[PDB]
Amino acid sequence: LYDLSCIDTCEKNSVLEVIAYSSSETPNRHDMLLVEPLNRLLQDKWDRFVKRIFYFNFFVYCLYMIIFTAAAYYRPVEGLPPYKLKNTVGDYFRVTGEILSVSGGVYFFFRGIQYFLQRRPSLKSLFVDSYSEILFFVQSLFMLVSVVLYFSQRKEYVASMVFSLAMGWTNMLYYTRGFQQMGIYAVMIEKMILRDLCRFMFVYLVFLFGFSTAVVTLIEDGKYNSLYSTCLELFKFTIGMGDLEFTENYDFKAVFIILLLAYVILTYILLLQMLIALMGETVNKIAQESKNIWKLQRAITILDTEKSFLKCMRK
Amino acid sequence: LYDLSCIDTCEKNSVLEVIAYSSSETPNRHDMLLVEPLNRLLQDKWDRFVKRIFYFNFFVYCLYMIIFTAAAYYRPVEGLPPYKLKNTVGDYFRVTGEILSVSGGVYFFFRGIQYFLQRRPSLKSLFVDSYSEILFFVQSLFMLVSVVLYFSQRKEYVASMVFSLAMGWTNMLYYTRGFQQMGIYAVMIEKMILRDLCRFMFVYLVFLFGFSTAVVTLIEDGKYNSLYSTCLELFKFTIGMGDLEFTENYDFKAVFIILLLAYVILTYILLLQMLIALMGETVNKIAQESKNIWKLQRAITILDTEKSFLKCMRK
Amino acid sequence: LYDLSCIDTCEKNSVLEVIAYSSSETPNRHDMLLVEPLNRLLQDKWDRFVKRIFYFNFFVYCLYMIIFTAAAYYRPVEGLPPYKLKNTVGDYFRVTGEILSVSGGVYFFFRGIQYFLQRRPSLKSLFVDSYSEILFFVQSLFMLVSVVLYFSQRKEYVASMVFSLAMGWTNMLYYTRGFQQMGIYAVMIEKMILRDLCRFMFVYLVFLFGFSTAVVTLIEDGKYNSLYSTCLELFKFTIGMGDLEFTENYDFKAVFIILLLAYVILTYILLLQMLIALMGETVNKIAQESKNIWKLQRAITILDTEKSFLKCMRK
Amino acid sequence: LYDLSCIDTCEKNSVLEVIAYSSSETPNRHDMLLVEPLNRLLQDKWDRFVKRIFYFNFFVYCLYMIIFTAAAYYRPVEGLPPYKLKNTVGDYFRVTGEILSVSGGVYFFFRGIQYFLQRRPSLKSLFVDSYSEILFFVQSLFMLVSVVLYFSQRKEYVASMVFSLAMGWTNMLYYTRGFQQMGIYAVMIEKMILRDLCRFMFVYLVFLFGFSTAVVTLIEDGKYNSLYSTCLELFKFTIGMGDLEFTENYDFKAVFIILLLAYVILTYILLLQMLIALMGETVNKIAQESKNIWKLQRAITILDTEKSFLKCMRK
């Protein structure tokens, strides 16, 4: 038996806390949890009770989402907000869900604020990992905005609400951290996004934009002279529905086609495939690292669980 | 020469049987067949006669499938079942195939039952490998259901029948196990399904659903307000036929487009490509393992062949 | 200096000939050319003159193809063959190219026959590598067939001719063997075809067919009840233009959609991506081997060059 | 401290210059910069001031591009050039941007000429790396051509201009060299283009062309008898919008379909996926090499910075 009390020397800073709140700059930020005493301990906690609490929290959240979903689905958008309830069961259910939706939003909002009270946002912006919390804050932000617009007689609230909704469904992935495979997968995802995806987009957009302006220049009208629509037409090539003959409003057919071909080859063929290639390599490079991260991710959850859960007695 | 009689000590449990019916939990479940005596023996059996019997069984099965296929293809769906045969050759052929189809269904059904009598279904559910047998059971199940509905005057039997049909064509892959390459390939397939595919879908569906509700919320009508149709519209982006302008029923064009773009980027671009990447890695990780499994798969077939085939005399 | 006369002991069998015409069963079939004396010699030959002759032959062939192409492009398909020339330059050019096309066909045909006179076709069928020659034979075969049909007053000759044409354009790749990169690439191609592609298709078609019959069964008419058209509709999903709502001729909408979804997921998503994954691994496995093969491929060409080219004096 | 004055012995040739202008044939062309003294020095320069100048130059360039873009976007193509300005703010802004666009074109043109005065174009053609400069020259070339055509009353100038525009947006990637990741990515891109992409296209086009002529031969008319349109129809299969039933103008439906299927399988399925596979391997092979190259790329920029920037005093 290891002297676990050392870890729990929170009077200064628990060993686990040191790790959990370690700066992204720390070399062993993840590697520190390779210690057998720490793993023994954390796994014990997880199985002993934390995962139960965790699953519960997840369950609650997914309920929140379907409640919110329904509220939006049956939302009487006809007219301007706020809307007057009528004496029906459906109306009762709607406003019930509506209220609950807002409540949960406030809950997450406030928690985000708590984190800001502790880990100030000037610090949080430096942790592209803590974003997993920030996203809930943003989600709730959209909720709150829609509340304002709703009571401001601004139907625009729908849009804000919708963004909140989508955010939540994205945020569902947060809870994959409770599974040594799903959470790992999620880690793979977030890293590839932060790396390869944005790397790709940086260039993708350059070509998208460049070619769209090239084409527009040639275009006389056809409702494609509007850059907005032309760039969408080019975008369509990369989703797989780009029409080479989308317009005839030009005197330079050959040139028009040439540009399209270049765009396709460079973007649709080359870059998209390249992306895949690089992604494969990124996977190779990570692998174990995602597992390392996942363990950390879970550990953090564990600590927060105990910290927030009434300081419940334990070993 | 090795003392092969040891292997054949079935009075307690044959060495090969030990392996064949080994729990999925066994560490060497597959590795046990790396023994030269076992391989010598099994390969001998295979070449000596088993593969001939196997090929025959395959042949019979593929006949079954085309018979069943034809029966369905020329099925007089006009009216309600059961249908009355007329004095024609085509009618004769139809009912002939129909009967045969049912018969083969019962055959597989019963065999599945036999397996349940031995390897109880409470055990079978724990072997995500024994599913190769279960699928035949399910196939036959659909057959039997269609029989009931047919005689119940319920045209719905067609649907059940169709599922049986499709199941069978899928189940054709069962017999790839007789080839050291096709069966191996099949192993690669089933593992990637059980791993990467379902892993992917778990998240794919989250985004699909989330975004579909987001969009529906914005939608006023256009026959897209129905979640069902909207989620299909989003699904279309991933097959390659998603229309960015599928509807105009909203007051928030910009937002509408934003959501679509997010969905595409996250799902169509990122996740689908990621999947490919991970699949490549999975292939790397397996490779030899699929071969190991294939050998086991064949060995099992061999044992069952001898066991079921009249206990035919052998070495 | 190595005693090169040993290699040239053709009175029994040249060392290079031994290798060139080595059975596919030979373990070192390709590895034998790793000998420094052989490489020294072969590279010398290549640079000294063979590659010049080779480039010439290529040049001639590509001329043949464009001549043939033009003949077909401007072919007066109106009416029935044989067609009567009129006193015009275009007619003169057409028949000129036509004759030349046939001539070159006969040339390749005859060469194929020569190979059969030597390396009998009973042997050739065992060399899935010698197909590089066979393809020219097949190409010429189609040519000859079209000649017959042409003079038989059968417009069907066009179809045969077209196949010959396509064959030739495919056969253009033959000459990539003169470049240590293009030929290597071609080797990568042919191996992946012979391996992964046909492996894939074996299963692809199973699902294609199976699902198509499933769907047809549900279909009442709509011109999709014809299996032929339905299977094409399913095929379209894998090229990227499959319509989930291609028909409404059924009483089981839900089921109809279910089947489509299964087909997409299993075939479009899973198998196609899997194929990519496996292809990547195949590339890894080959790499050097394709280079080895390429060297052999070139060596063979070299030997044939000298053998056919007037037995021109050399070192 | 290393004796840095040795590096600066430019009276003969600076050590860095030796490397920077090293022939592509040099074995250590890139490896030479692995020297710790060189890296120390170059990194110092970069951070000390070069990167600031570099960022500035980039900034200027991106301004140039958006100015040019706007000029084209609001270009009164109605009638024939040169166009007469009217007394409006928009006209003033247009011609302002127009002039600026030409000016920057001349700037890059002249610089290209300067390089030709030094590193003669007979040499430049041998450096498929120096193309990064050539592209600016080509960009400016198109600009100058449009100027001529503009004043020649030839509306065709638009086309030339458009090409210049697109070139510039492509050339934006030049400046990714200032980032150890973006520039590296760009290196990955250019290599894969120069290698795999053109390798692919070499064969892709063979099949594209071959099959297009095959199909045309069958075609009676339908506006597809024109090879140009048919080859586009085939091209569409690879972008994901190829229609199997694009025409009915033929007497050989079966054959028509067969050809299409072959084209799809060989090109759309096989080759495109193969390309991806090879690309993955190319990534594996490069990796570090791209980083090496990137460092060189930056070093070159550094040297040119100092050389062109007033010979500003330094260590």
PDB file of N, CA, C and O in Angstrom, chain D residues 259-277:
ATOM      1  N   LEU D 259     -19.000  -0.027 -71.153  1.00  0.00           N
ATOM      2  CA  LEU D 259     -17.894   0.887 -71.228  1.00  0.00           C
ATOM      3  C   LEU D 259     -17.885   1.814 -70.060  1.00  0.00           C
ATOM      4  O   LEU D 259     -16.833   2.077 -69.478  1.00  0.00           O
ATOM      5  N   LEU D 260     -19.059   2.298 -69.692  1.00  0.00           N
ATOM      6  CA  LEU D 260     -19.166   3.204 -68.581  1.00  0.00           C
ATOM      7  C   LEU D 260     -18.741   2.539 -67.309  1.00  0.00           C
ATOM      8  O   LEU D 260     -18.032   3.133 -66.503  1.00  0.00           O
ATOM      9  N   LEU D 261     -19.148   1.294 -67.135  1.00  0.00           N
ATOM     10  CA  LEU D 261     -18.828   0.561 -65.936  1.00  0.00           C
ATOM     11  C   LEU D 261     -17.351   0.352 -65.819  1.00  0.00           C
ATOM     12  O   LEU D 261     -16.784   0.497 -64.740  1.00  0.00           O
ATOM     13  N   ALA D 262     -16.715   0.032 -66.936  1.00  0.00           N
ATOM     14  CA  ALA D 262     -15.291  -0.173 -66.953  1.00  0.00           C
ATOM     15  C   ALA D 262     -14.586   1.094 -66.560  1.00  0.00           C
ATOM     16  O   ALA D 262     -13.685   1.077 -65.728  1.00  0.00           O
ATOM     17  N   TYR D 263     -15.008   2.198 -67.148  1.00  0.00           N
ATOM     18  CA  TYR D 263     -14.429   3.482 -66.847  1.00  0.00           C
ATOM     19  C   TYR D 263     -14.540   3.810 -65.372  1.00  0.00           C
ATOM     20  O   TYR D 263     -13.575   4.245 -64.749  1.00  0.00           O
ATOM     21  N   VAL D 264     -15.720   3.617 -64.819  1.00  0.00           N
ATOM     22  CA  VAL D 264     -15.924   3.892 -63.419  1.00  0.00           C
ATOM     23  C   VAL D 264     -15.037   3.048 -62.555  1.00  0.00           C
ATOM     24  O   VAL D 264     -14.301   3.572 -61.721  1.00  0.00           O
ATOM     25  N   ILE D 265     -15.064   1.757 -62.762  1.00  0.00           N
ATOM     26  CA  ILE D 265     -14.299   0.852 -61.947  1.00  0.00           C
ATOM     27  C   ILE D 265     -12.828   1.126 -62.017  1.00  0.00           C
ATOM     28  O   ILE D 265     -12.143   1.128 -60.999  1.00  0.00           O
ATOM     29  N   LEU D 266     -12.328   1.334 -63.212  1.00  0.00           N
ATOM     30  CA  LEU D 266     -10.916   1.529 -63.383  1.00  0.00           C
ATOM     31  C   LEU D 266     -10.481   2.884 -62.921  1.00  0.00           C
ATOM     32  O   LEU D 266      -9.435   3.023 -62.295  1.00  0.00           O
ATOM     33  N   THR D 267     -11.258   3.892 -63.220  1.00  0.00           N
ATOM     34  CA  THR D 267     -10.851   5.228 -62.912  1.00  0.00           C
ATOM     35  C   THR D 267     -11.399   5.692 -61.597  1.00  0.00           C
ATOM     36  O   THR D 267     -10.643   6.047 -60.689  1.00  0.00           O
ATOM     37  N   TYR D 268     -12.714   5.726 -61.497  1.00  0.00           N
ATOM     38  CA  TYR D 268     -13.342   6.266 -60.304  1.00  0.00           C
ATOM     39  C   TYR D 268     -13.028   5.473 -59.074  1.00  0.00           C
ATOM     40  O   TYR D 268     -12.731   6.041 -58.026  1.00  0.00           O
ATOM     41  N   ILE D 269     -13.143   4.171 -59.160  1.00  0.00           N
ATOM     42  CA  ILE D 269     -12.898   3.368 -57.998  1.00  0.00           C
ATOM     43  C   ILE D 269     -11.424   3.126 -57.820  1.00  0.00           C
ATOM     44  O   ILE D 269     -10.807   3.658 -56.900  1.00  0.00           O
ATOM     45  N   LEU D 270     -10.863   2.326 -58.697  1.00  0.00           N
ATOM     46  CA  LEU D 270      -9.502   1.878 -58.571  1.00  0.00           C
ATOM     47  C   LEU D 270      -8.480   2.991 -58.477  1.00  0.00           C
ATOM     48  O   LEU D 270      -7.801   3.120 -57.462  1.00  0.00           O
ATOM     49  N   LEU D 271      -8.330   3.763 -59.546  1.00  0.00           N
ATOM     50  CA  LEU D 271      -7.250   4.731 -59.601  1.00  0.00           C
ATOM     51  C   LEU D 271      -7.348   5.827 -58.568  1.00  0.00           C
ATOM     52  O   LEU D 271      -6.339   6.187 -57.967  1.00  0.00           O
ATOM     53  N   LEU D 272      -8.536   6.360 -58.339  1.00  0.00           N
ATOM     54  CA  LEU D 272      -8.653   7.426 -57.353  1.00  0.00           C
ATOM     55  C   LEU D 272      -8.287   6.944 -55.973  1.00  0.00           C
ATOM     56  O   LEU D 272      -7.620   7.653 -55.219  1.00  0.00           O
ATOM     57  N   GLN D 273      -8.707   5.740 -55.638  1.00  0.00           N
ATOM     58  CA  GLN D 273      -8.401   5.193 -54.343  1.00  0.00           C
ATOM     59  C   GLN D 273      -6.938   4.858 -54.247  1.00  0.00           C
ATOM     60  O   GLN D 273      -6.313   5.058 -53.207  1.00  0.00           O
ATOM     61  N   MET D 274      -6.380   4.363 -55.341  1.00  0.00           N
ATOM     62  CA  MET D 274      -4.980   4.041 -55.400  1.00  0.00           C
ATOM     63  C   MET D 274      -4.166   5.245 -55.149  1.00  0.00           C
ATOM     64  O   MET D 274      -3.174   5.192 -54.429  1.00  0.00           O
ATOM     65  N   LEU D 275      -4.571   6.339 -55.753  1.00  0.00           N
ATOM     66  CA  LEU D 275      -3.907   7.584 -55.563  1.00  0.00           C
ATOM     67  C   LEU D 275      -3.829   7.914 -54.104  1.00  0.00           C
ATOM     68  O   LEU D 275      -2.754   8.204 -53.597  1.00  0.00           O
ATOM     69  N   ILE D 276      -4.956   7.821 -53.410  1.00  0.00           N
ATOM     70  CA  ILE D 276      -4.983   8.081 -51.979  1.00  0.00           C
ATOM     71  C   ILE D 276      -3.966   7.229 -51.252  1.00  0.00           C
ATOM     72  O   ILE D 276      -3.232   7.721 -50.396  1.00  0.00           O
ATOM     73  N   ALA D 277      -3.942   5.947 -51.582  1.00  0.00           N
ATOM     74  CA  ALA D 277      -3.033   5.005 -50.959  1.00  0.00           C
ATOM     75  C   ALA D 277      -1.593   5.445 -51.131  1.00  0.00           C
ATOM     76  O   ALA D 277      -0.823   5.485 -50.166  1.00  0.00           O
TER      77      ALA D 277
END
